Amino acid sequence: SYVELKDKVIVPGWPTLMLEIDFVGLNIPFLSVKEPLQLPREKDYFTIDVEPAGHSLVNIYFQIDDFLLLTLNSLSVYKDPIRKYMFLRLNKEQSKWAINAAFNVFSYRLRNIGVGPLGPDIRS
Amino acid sequence: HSYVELKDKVIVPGWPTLMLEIDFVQFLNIPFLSVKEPLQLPREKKLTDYFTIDVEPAGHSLVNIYFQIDDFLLLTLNSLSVYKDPIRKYMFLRLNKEQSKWAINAAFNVFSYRLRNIGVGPLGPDIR
Amino acid sequence: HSYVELKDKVIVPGWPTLMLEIDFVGGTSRNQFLNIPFLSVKEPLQLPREKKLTDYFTIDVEPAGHSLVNIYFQIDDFLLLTLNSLSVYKDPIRKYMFLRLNKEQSKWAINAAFNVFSYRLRNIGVGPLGPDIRS
Amino acid sequence: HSYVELKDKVIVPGWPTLMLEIDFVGGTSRNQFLNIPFLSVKEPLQLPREKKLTDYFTIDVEPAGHSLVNIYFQIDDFLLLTLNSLSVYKDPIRKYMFLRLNKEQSKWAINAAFNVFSYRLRNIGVGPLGPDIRS
Amino acid sequence: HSYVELKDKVIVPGWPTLMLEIDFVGGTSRNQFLNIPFLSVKEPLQLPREKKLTDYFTIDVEPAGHSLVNIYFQIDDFLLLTLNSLSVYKDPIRKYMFLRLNKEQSKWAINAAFNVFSYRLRNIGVGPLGPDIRS
Amino acid sequence: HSYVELKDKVIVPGWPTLMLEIDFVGGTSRNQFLNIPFLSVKEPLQLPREKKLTDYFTIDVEPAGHSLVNIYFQIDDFLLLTLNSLSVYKDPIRKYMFLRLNKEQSKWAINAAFNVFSYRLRNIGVGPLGPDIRS
Amino acid sequence: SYVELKDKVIVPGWPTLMLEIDFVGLNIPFLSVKEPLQLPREKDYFTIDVEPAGHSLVNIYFQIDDFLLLTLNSLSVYKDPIRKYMFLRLNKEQSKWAINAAFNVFSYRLRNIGVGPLGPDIRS
Amino acid sequence: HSYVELKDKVIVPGWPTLMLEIDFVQFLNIPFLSVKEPLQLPREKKLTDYFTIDVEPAGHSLVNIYFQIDDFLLLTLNSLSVYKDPIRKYMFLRLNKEQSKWAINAAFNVFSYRLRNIGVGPLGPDIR
Amino acid sequence: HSYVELKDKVIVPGWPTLMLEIDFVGGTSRNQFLNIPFLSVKEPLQLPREKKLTDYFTIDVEPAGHSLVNIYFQIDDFLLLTLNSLSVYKDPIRKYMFLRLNKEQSKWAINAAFNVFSYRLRNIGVGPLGPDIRS
Amino acid sequence: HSYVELKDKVIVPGWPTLMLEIDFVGGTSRNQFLNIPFLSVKEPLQLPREKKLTDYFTIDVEPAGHSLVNIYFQIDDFLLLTLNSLSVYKDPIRKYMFLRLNKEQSKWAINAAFNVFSYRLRNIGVGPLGPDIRS
Amino acid sequence: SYVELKDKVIVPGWPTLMLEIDFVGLNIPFLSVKEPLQLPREKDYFTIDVEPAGHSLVNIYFQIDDFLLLTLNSLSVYKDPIRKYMFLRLNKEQSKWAINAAFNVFSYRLRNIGVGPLGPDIRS
Amino acid sequence: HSYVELKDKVIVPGWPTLMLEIDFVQFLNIPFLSVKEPLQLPREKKLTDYFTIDVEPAGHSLVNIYFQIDDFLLLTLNSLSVYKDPIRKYMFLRLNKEQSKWAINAAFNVFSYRLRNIGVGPLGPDIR
Ligand SMILES: [Cl-]
Ligand SMILES: [Cl-]
Ligand SMILES: [Cl-]
Ligand SMILES: [Cl-]
Ligand SMILES: [Cl-]
Ligand SMILES: [Cl-]
């Protein structure tokens, strides 16, 4: 059964893990992390499934390997939020392109996004 | 006759979908219904003869799509449906803010519409 | 004077629609206009010969939030009366009113710095299920 | 150093406006621009001779969830006292604040990976019914 | 004065067409205009700098039956002469004239209560068989 | 009680108009409305205080063949004397008359199964050349 | 050979039999009747054929069974107008939709249409 | 050259049809000719190379479609025709009131046109 | 005064474009307009409330050859300054200038005998590769 | 009898224009017309009472390569002296000259097999900035 | 190898041989001639190939038979310009329709075009 | 990144062609590249996922089409190319005068684009 990866896993001021979905024919903040995620050079361990949840809503379902589950829980700012089976709810403005592509994913990736000038200061 | 709302519960993650696709006289794609298997009408017969739409405004910014679904399609969609028989003869869908805007700017004038089968994703079966 | 809201209830599905077409200074092309459903009417609005909406109707778009605008207007007496006579909902028009735009509609007003180029009236009828939708 | 929200109440229809204008490095379709009515003011804001806003006003766009983004800012004492003087709602500006982007604006911010190319602050005046709306 | 009919004979297939574009108050959208072929011409109508059709030409739509309208017009001297000089058919324009609309064209005039929003001139050339059609 | 045709001759260009306005229950595309110039009048028609037209004026739409439809009406004595007084063509109104719909109008009437939702009578004034056209 | 069902078979003030054609991808007054046509509960006996007759004209051809031929002749206001093989001429405004559907009929029916307030009075 | 009118006699009830279909730069469908059997040109060859149209106004409200039909198509249409060889090289069709209106509003500007086979109806043979 | 050329260098790929939309008297339809890229800008041009381009800007199309025209213009002080402040290229606008049209653009001006019907401003953003194209 | 080119220098922005207008027998899409600014003039050209231009002015369109075409002309003494008198650039008109068509114009000329149906010469005045442009 | 048929082969005032290409789904001045080309009654001896040469440019390649090569060289105003293998360069305005037809030629021909009123006079 | 111009040398007479076809929101056809053999991507895969365009003005009258070509397509086009490997990741094409005009009037707004194979002509082999 799939558990919701809630908004509280985003903590302003910290760096961000961004999910980035390229559709056939979209960035999503995934996890605030204590430091950048870096796999060893030249190395997926999570599946994504884009599914409709409404007349203009989409959810993203995740299957995350034990290996990446531990690395993410290690790196995460909020405490141990990552489970094996999860989902994110997109809002209508975000769901738009997923709907128009009929949920057909060309490619996805996970990127590190730094913090801006006032970064450490928002953390207090 | 009373127009019943086709609500979001009708879309169930992990199952194939019918997509309502509307062209104004630009292009709306709306997940209409989660179905257990696809939908494919008798030799060369067409949706539009079983399904009437009417776009009207519901306020200063929001718009509704009203529909009359004839008996043959009502029965078929209810059999295919994943959620418990949600199709009534007289229904409406609420368009979102952006979709409403394009409908208003088109003066509610539809060029064409259709229902299309959209298959499930990689983890679909598991999400069920 | 007091500016009273022209509320969404004034639009009644199943009836013809009096639309406000607003054209903003700037923009991309002539496909850019903001159409606002203004009032549901029993019959189309028709104006005296040689008159246009601008002869009876002053508008003013103003911000109401960080991504919201309102459209304020002053309606001359003749139009106020014609509009109350035509309205499906009982006599909703007052001299001084405003329409709340939503965030999608407001974007266009805000990006033009509230500067209206022109505006005019349109009458839109009802679709094939219209009588049925009224009941 | 906790950041206070600059809320909608600080925009008062009928009065001049200070507009915050942000453009991102990409993450936006071609003709989408980010303009935010920032503060209703009693009279225009003027900076002193050759002084770029970036000297008094710092911004940082950051995600607050999977969908929503806030714009955090640090305003120096000069501009703070000036804006609080010009403001219509009573002294709402603090040194450390944030402004909530709407869902659409948040998606452009997210798709731009929060990368700001430039920002600015502009005076926009009131419309023909402005003085009347105030009352 | 006597209003004389501008008859259909004044349109001569094979030649360029001076068109009257009429926009009525109300209506559905900006794709709604009534185009009337006005006169076949030897060359396009060109007007003096800064002048438009409305500076030389007053129109008045009036009903002529239960589903017929006529368009009456008064043509200023300069345009009357330019038009007779350009006309393919020999000198048909008089100061005071009317065009009979048919029942299809009249519908649009009638539904707007004869209220013209604006009007202007267009020049339309001849198609690939045009010279051949002249003979 | 034989019904007399109200013919086109009763519409005289240059003079004000009484417009008969009918809308059917369906049997019409969205933006098609049924407006019929009914009588040219020397001055506007006013009803007395709070008196709905349906009290003086009865209508019945009926087919006259496979394609054409007539609108039959019964006009009470007050309105008849009033319309005959205001009329420009000499006393053409009788108690029992019909009006022929055109082919298009007849098709909307036929497709609506002759079902009238409401009807009304409206004053429309004359255009800028009106007084001149009369003569 | 097919005989024209003329306009004189429509007599104002009387109730109407309406032919109603639904095209794939249109009401027509058919016959004025002395009283409503009612078949016995749960019960076609006429064929229609929509054929072009001009660059913007269509005709409707009818084959009517002996049974319905007699019932219609019984019910008709004008005297015994119904023959076995007939046609109606549509005008251009009526032919429009028949032409745009390439004469492809989804369904047809015959409906009773009452008369309005001034009904009996127009008959005199 | 003299342009001859293609009149309504050319459309004979009960037979298959060629439909002229015109798109302006909305959509005109015009029964063009009653044919004894369909029409289907040589491998991958196209009508437009044998058939030139020119829409022009004939008055303040009516419009005509003028056409030049090249020899190969002239012969073929005359062989297929039901009425006695009515196709000449230079002809015109009169558009109706509504069709005229859309032509005028399009400034006589055609995007595309074509000839399409349309089969007979149920009683067709009998009506012949 | 001296009319100085507003040269092509003033357009800088990668930045938003201030466009001049010009509508000529005559022509075929309302799809006929001549769009001229006028100046690349750091942000969209926004004008004061109730003002349009025509309130600050006079144009004059004149021939410069057998198939070339130039567009001359006089820019009022307020717009000159707003434009120099917005321009990507350093302060290019002077009070009196001209744009060279090429032979394709000139054709439309020439066929209208240089007679402008109306004109207005449009702001066009940058496409998906825009930031990258700037470098 | 060698033909001299009438070059672009003879068109001087800011001054009235004589326009050469040619239409071919076919070889042109419907709405393409051939207008050529011919000579800038200090004041309009008038012909004497009932005298068709063809009496003073002869033209011959001929190819000068696979792509380019010239318009050759023979101008009689009266018109030559008159045009040289009116001209702004000093006496540029000779008895035998040619004018180069541009690539587009040359293609219409080539596709029309150089067949001219008629030609004419028209006065076009100057725009609102005309006197100022001259200087 | 194909040789360019240059513009100098067009001499104003003389009559013209016009190449005329009709595209599937364009006139070109070919040769100024001393007198009209006329083949004997009821009688191609040249191939054309429309090829792209640029993002909006097309060239026309010619293969001309010995027979037509001699007749053309005989008739030509400029001296003996015709070789067996040649090409013409079109400009962008001329290339337009060739590009939009994807270089697919429905038919080509060679036509005689006379000279205008000032014809003999431009030759001097 | 520096945008390199795809110049006319890249089009070599006598060889098949790829045609860039652009639709604005009218229709541009541009010979893009001379290829030694056609181009035909893997089962049901689409150009648009390997190829980004951006139309921008370069002056008061001329317009450029800028493009980012992804690695898979870069390698394929360079292998097929007749001229010596001319495809770089970041390039631009100059539109002609007329093409520029339609781009400007469309406000640089592309509806769709594609690459199409166009075969050689009769004398093609010989011209090589
Ligand atoms: Cl208006
Ligand atoms: Cl974009
Ligand atoms: Cl005008
Ligand atoms: Cl409808
Ligand atoms: Cl403007
Ligand atoms: Cl054409």
Side-chain angles (χ1 to χ4, degrees), chain B residues 82-124:
Chain B
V82 175
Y83 185 89
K84 182 156 52 68
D85 292 332
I87 304 298
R88 307 294 184 260
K89 180 157 174 188
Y90 305 104
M91 310 196 86
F92 72 93
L93 270 171
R94 294 182 188 284
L95 300 185
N96 69 30
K97 294 181 317 211
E98 182 172 17
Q99 284 165 351
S100 295
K101 193 236 182 184
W102 302 125
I104 289 166
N105 283 5
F108 318 121
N109 208 295
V110 183
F111 179 62
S112 71
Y113 58 104
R114 44 193 307 162
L115 232 29
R116 290 270 217 152
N117 294 286
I118 305 304
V120 201
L123 302 164

Side-chain angles (χ1 to χ4, degrees), chain D residues 8-19:
Chain D
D8 272 0
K9 64 189 195 197
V10 85
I11 303 300
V12 191
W15 293 96
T17 300
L18 219 31
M19 192 107 235

Side-chain angles (χ1 to χ4, degrees), chain H residues 100-115:
Chain H
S100 295
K101 193 236 182 184
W102 302 125
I104 289 166
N105 283 5
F108 318 121
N109 208 295
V110 183
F111 179 62
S112 71
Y113 58 104
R114 44 193 307 162
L115 232 29

Side-chain angles (χ1 to χ4, degrees), chain A residues 5-7 10 12 16 18 26-30 88-89 91 93-94 97 113 115-119 121-122 124, chain D residues 1-3 58-68 70 72-74 96 103-104 107 110-114:
Chain A
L5 178 68
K6 291 214 168 209
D7 279 328
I10 307 299
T16 304
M18 191 74 92
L26 180 56
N27 279 356
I28 315 177
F30 185 71
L88 288 165
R89 295 187 179 285
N91 63 26
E93 351 298 295
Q94 295 188 290
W97 285 117
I113 309 306
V115 190
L118 310 179
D121 196 18
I122 307 143
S124 78
Chain D
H1 294 42
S2 79
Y3 293 68
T58 275
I59 80 174
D60 188 357
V61 187
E62 298 302 334
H66 306 299
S67 301
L68 298 166
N70 293 321
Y72 293 91
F73 37 93
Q74 174 170 295
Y96 298 107
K103 292 162 183 176
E104 189 178 36
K107 186 233 293 202
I110 289 162
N111 290 344
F114 324 110

Side-chain angles (χ1 to χ4, degrees), chain F residues 21-55:
Chain F
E21 301 187 358
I22 300 177
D23 38 64
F24 297 104
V25 175
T28 191
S29 82
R30 99 145 52 217
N31 290 301
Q32 292 164 336
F33 302 93
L34 184 40
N35 298 275
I36 310 176
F38 184 74
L39 199 64
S40 302
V41 289
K42 286 169 301 223
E43 73 173 19
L45 174 79
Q46 266 130 355
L47 302 172
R49 294 194 312 281
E50 293 226 57
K51 288 288 176 179
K52 256 257 66 61
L53 167 78
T54 175
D55 293 318

Side-chain angles (χ1 to χ4, degrees), chain A residues 37-51:
Chain A
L37 171 62
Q38 191 57 46
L39 299 185
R41 57 279 308 157
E42 200 194 313
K43 290 295 187 170
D44 59 61
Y45 314 99
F46 76 121
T47 306
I48 78 181
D49 188 34
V50 180
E51 292 291 315

Side-chain angles (χ1 to χ4, degrees), chain A:
Chain A
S1 99
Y2 291 69
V3 159
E4 200 183 352
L5 178 68
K6 291 214 168 209
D7 279 328
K8 68 181 162 199
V9 152
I10 307 299
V11 190
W14 296 93
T16 304
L17 220 40
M18 191 74 92
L19 173 54
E20 307 192 347
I21 318 195
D22 186 358
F23 285 106
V24 166
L26 180 56
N27 279 356
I28 315 177
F30 185 71
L31 201 57
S32 290
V33 285
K34 280 182 295 202
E35 63 207 0
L37 171 62
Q38 191 57 46
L39 299 185
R41 57 279 308 157
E42 200 194 313
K43 290 295 187 170
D44 59 61
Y45 314 99
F46 76 121
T47 306
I48 78 181
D49 188 34
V50 180
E51 292 291 315
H55 296 308
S56 56
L57 289 166
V58 157
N59 292 339
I60 308 187
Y61 291 86
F62 302 97
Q63 227 198 269
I64 318 178
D65 292 353
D66 317 301
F67 158 68
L68 185 57
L69 190 147
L70 284 184
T71 309
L72 294 179
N73 275 327
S74 159
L75 296 174
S76 160
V77 166
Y78 187 88
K79 203 166 84 74
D80 292 340
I82 304 305
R83 303 294 172 270
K84 185 179 177 173
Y85 300 107
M86 303 184 94
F87 72 103
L88 288 165
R89 295 187 179 285
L90 305 194
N91 63 26
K92 298 178 169 104
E93 351 298 295
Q94 295 188 290
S95 298
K96 177 168 160 172
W97 285 117
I99 287 173
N100 295 334
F103 333 114
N104 197 9
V105 182
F106 175 70
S107 72
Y108 60 99
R109 66 172 315 162
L110 219 35
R111 288 291 213 74
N112 292 292
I113 309 306
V115 190
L118 310 179
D121 196 18
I122 307 143
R123 302 172 195 166
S124 78

Side-chain angles (χ1 to χ4, degrees), chain E residues 52-53 120-121, chain I residues 25 117:
Chain E
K52 298 162 167 56
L53 186 59
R120 58 181 296 184
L121 82 96
Chain I
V25 174
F117 187 90

